[PDB]
Design a protein around this nucleic acid. Sequence first.
DNA 1: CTCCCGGCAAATTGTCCG
DNA 2: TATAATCGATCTTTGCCGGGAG
Lengths: 48, 56
Amino acid sequence: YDGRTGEPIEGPIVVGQMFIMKLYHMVEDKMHARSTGPYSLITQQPLG
Amino acid sequence: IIRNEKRMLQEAVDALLDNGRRGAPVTNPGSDRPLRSLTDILSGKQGRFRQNLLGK
DNA sequence: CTCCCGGCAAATTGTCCG
DNA sequence: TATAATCGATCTTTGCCGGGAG
């Protein structure tokens, strides 16, 4: 049953228990943004 | 002796401009890493042109 | 002339690199 | 500043362009 409507899904759907893992790649770690910041010595371009 | 000194001087100029181009690459003591000469700085994927100039 | 041989120059990108 | 001492010590991809030798 669709919890939004209450109406059934128009077809029977495969449901069961699956083993699913949370991998080491998490947004908290990867989100990054910069306006201005450190520059490199010789090139004076932003660091990495 | 003066001849030896002169040929060593050429090799010193050679490593400074393009190290490894002719002869054994000059290395810091106790490292196999060739020193990075002016030519190495200009050229290659890591060089001045393709690293800081065509993209930043 | 015509051809191997050697010497030199190249070999994807972001992230990361603890 | 003084016996004499006299020659060193490591090594394992593909495409293009120039040169000497056959």
